């Protein structure tokens, strides 16, 4: 070849991924309707195996084999940006549901928001702490990025460790707030909007935290150069996305919706 | 477009067989179901 693009070795992971999607969806069906978790647990397992092997192979292709030319890295930049846009439009649907319900509360609710019998969380207590935590993690990840660009291994690791610790603190605080909440997902459209929107956000925080932990171990193993570290860039972009979604949830559901 | 003559020419008789088999593959199973609807 005399172009700069990557001809990928034939791979089984697309098929194992597609089959893991069949097993997770048929498994959710089997759990919701036939009182059984077996297919779902097989699907989750094959999904995790597929993700591990596929992204392992991308590291092999890039760090170990050198296939990530500038042209290839440019494509991955576009891919990650487009993926994030699709996730923004997914959350947009949940915000639309929330505004639809809260701006025109029906008679079943008492014709008010919050509904009769709903006691919202105080947005100045744990929700404000969660806001400080994710904003702080946006600062620490920026420190990590500049440390890596400046060639500073120790400070990159310290900054990224702080960022991960804050993501874990957010997750533990949210878990505690779920347990302590006096309302549930079954508490009408208030509970529905609150838990589905914050729940998908929580899942994205766990995914982003996992991505940062992958970057932490890759950094420990010297994979990143001061100029070439797209996995870290992508993890940082994703983490900023999770921050921004939180700020919109905080203002919309916790504060304005209280 | 230009093309070579057929490597394995399909005569009029061969075409009638292929067309007949193709039509029967669509018509017989559906026909069996629709004929037996009353029974179902």
């Amino acid at each position: 070849q005399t172009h700069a693009y990557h001809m990928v070795n034939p791979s089984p992971w697309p098929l194992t991924g597609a089959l893991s999607a069949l097993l997770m969806t048929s498994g959710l069906t089997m759990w919701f309707h036939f009182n059984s978790m077996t297919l779902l647990m097989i699907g989750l397992t094959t999904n995790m195996l597929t993700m591990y092997q596929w992204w392992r192979d991308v590291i092999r292709e890039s760090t170990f084999q050198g296939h990530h030319t500038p042209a290839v890295q440019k494509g991955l930049r576009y891919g990650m940006i487009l993926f994030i846009i699709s996730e923004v439009l997914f959350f947009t649907g949940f915000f639309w549901a929330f505004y639809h319900s809260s701006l025109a509360p029906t008679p079943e609710l008492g014709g008010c928001w919050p509904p009769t019998g709903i006691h919202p969380l105080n947005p100045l207590e744990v929700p404000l702490l969660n806001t400080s935590v994710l904003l702080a993690s946006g600062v620490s990840i920026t420190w990590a990025h500049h440390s890596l660009m400046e060639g500073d291994r120790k400070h990159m690791l310290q900054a990224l460790f702080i960022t991960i610790t804050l993501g874990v603190y957010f997750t533990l605080l949210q878990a505690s707030e779920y347990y302590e909440a006096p309302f549930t997902i079954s508490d009408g459209v208030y509970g529905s909007t609150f838990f589905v929107a914050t729940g998908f956000h929580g899942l994205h925080v766990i995914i982003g935290s996992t991505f940062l932990i992958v970057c932490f171990f890759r950094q420990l193993k010297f994979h990143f150069t001061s100029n070439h570290h797209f996995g870290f860039e992508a993890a940082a972009w994703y983490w900023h996305f999770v921050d921004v979604v939180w700020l919109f949830l905080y203002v919309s559901i916790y504060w304005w919706g209280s | 477009i230009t093309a070579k003559p057929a490597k394995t020419p399909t005569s009029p008789k061969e075409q009638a067989i292929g067309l007949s088999v193709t039509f029967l593959s669509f018509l017989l199973p559906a026909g069996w179901v629709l004929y037996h609807l009353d029974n179902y």
Binding site: N9, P10, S11, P12, W13, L15, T16, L19, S20, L22, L23, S26, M30, H33, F34, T38, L39, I42, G43, T45, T46, L49, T50, Q53, D57, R60, E61, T63, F64, Q65, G66, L220, K221, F222, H223 | -
Partner: protein
């Protein structure tokens, strides 16, 4: 820790015709066999479940 990236570069560039998903050695083959066995076995089980669920 020490930087052992050069040793992994040599391993994954070896001229042995292996595709990248197997080029780490025998552990890759085992993890592949486990993954594909669970996927194909799970898929056959999902078809059995459809057969069961298709009748009252």
């Amino acid at each position: 820790f020490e930087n052992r990236v050069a040793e992994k570069q040599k391993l994954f560039q070896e001229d042995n015709g292996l595709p990248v998903h197997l080029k780490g050695g025998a552990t890759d083959n085992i993890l592949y066999r486990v993954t594909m066995t669970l996927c194909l076995g799970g898929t056959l089980y999902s078809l059995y479940c459809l057969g069961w669920a298709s009748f009252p």
